[PDB]
Amino acid sequence: ALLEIIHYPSKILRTISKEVVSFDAKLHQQLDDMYETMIASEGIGLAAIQVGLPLRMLIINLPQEDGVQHKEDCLEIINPKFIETGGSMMYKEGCLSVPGFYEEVERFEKVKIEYQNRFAEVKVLEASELLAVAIQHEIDHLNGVLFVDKLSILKRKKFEKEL
Ligand SMILES: [Co+2]
């Protein structure tokens, strides 16, 4: 089923999500709805609080060569945690919770996270470029952080203007 996406400046987006403990059918339905909702709004990433669920879980499905997304490449990241971080780069970002606005944000160029899939199976993932960016962006959501929070003084004004 489709879920309503929460938009800035809702305080719901400032919520600190909690660790997932029950990896059951209810959690799986939430993840399915999150995927259905993400694709319907044409997003590549989506955190649980973006649909009102204060759970530490997010999904990322980057489009490949053909430019299309394939449900098979969809990552379901739960209870994520950074093992290592490195580098620095500027990346222009967008967000389903901040429709219409895009701005450059400083991100680590390389990251390594540990997490669990929907079956509670521990996973380790190294990422760079777009995937590394999506991971950092989505994880920020779990901690109540939006990318417009990471804008420089100059760009933060450009945001308040386009508002
Ligand atoms: Co976002």
Side-chain angles (χ1 to χ4, degrees):
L2 283 182
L3 300 184
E4 169 63 64
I5 294 175
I6 299 176
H7 305 302
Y8 169 90
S10 173
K11 275 194 184 304
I12 294 181
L13 297 175
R14 298 312 181 178
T15 300
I16 287 181
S17 295
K18 306 299 183 51
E19 299 261 287
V20 167
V21 62
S22 301
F23 292 76
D24 45 43
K26 182 180 60 182
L27 197 296
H28 297 167
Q29 183 62 56
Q30 298 178 310
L31 288 169
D32 286 337
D33 290 345
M34 274 174 72
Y35 190 72
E36 181 174 346
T37 300
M38 182 182 77
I39 297 308
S41 288
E42 283 145 51
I44 61 178
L46 183 73
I49 25 75
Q50 284 183 285
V51 293
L53 293 179
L55 302 175
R56 300 184 77 72
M57 60 183 198
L58 61 96
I59 56 175
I60 294 168
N61 191 29
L62 306 188
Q64 51 181 60
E65 303 176 302
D66 50 50
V68 321
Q69 299 170 298
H70 286 291
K71 193 178 178 65
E72 289 177 354
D73 306 326
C74 182
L75 295 170
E76 287 177 340
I77 295 173
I78 308 173
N79 299 334
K81 177 170 301 178
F82 287 101
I83 299 180
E84 77 172 307
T85 185
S88 170
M89 62 181 201
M90 297 309 294
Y91 206 91
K92 175 155 290 190
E93 290 176 35
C95 181
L96 290 182
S97 287
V98 193
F101 183 71
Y102 311 87
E103 193 54 81
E104 295 190 308
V105 182
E106 184 168 349
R107 298 287 185 186
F108 289 112
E109 53 189 301
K110 186 174 174 184
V111 308
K112 202 205 212 74
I113 59 169
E114 185 183 315
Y115 66 92
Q116 302 175 75
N117 63 186
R118 69 161 60 187
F119 302 114
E121 309 182 311
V122 176
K123 305 286 179 183
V124 174
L125 178 62
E126 302 157 279
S128 61
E129 300 179 305
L130 183 49
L131 179 63
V133 173
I135 286 177
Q136 292 171 67
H137 179 105
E138 294 313 325
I139 285 176
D140 270 351
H141 274 307
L142 308 190
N143 302 319
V145 174
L146 301 177
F147 79 103
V148 295
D149 296 348
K150 290 173 145 57
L151 299 181
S152 64
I153 296 179
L154 181 64
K155 296 304 181 181
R156 176 158 145 289
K157 310 304 177 178
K158 183 174 175 295
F159 167 69
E160 306 178 306
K161 180 198 67 182
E162 295 174 52
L163 201 293

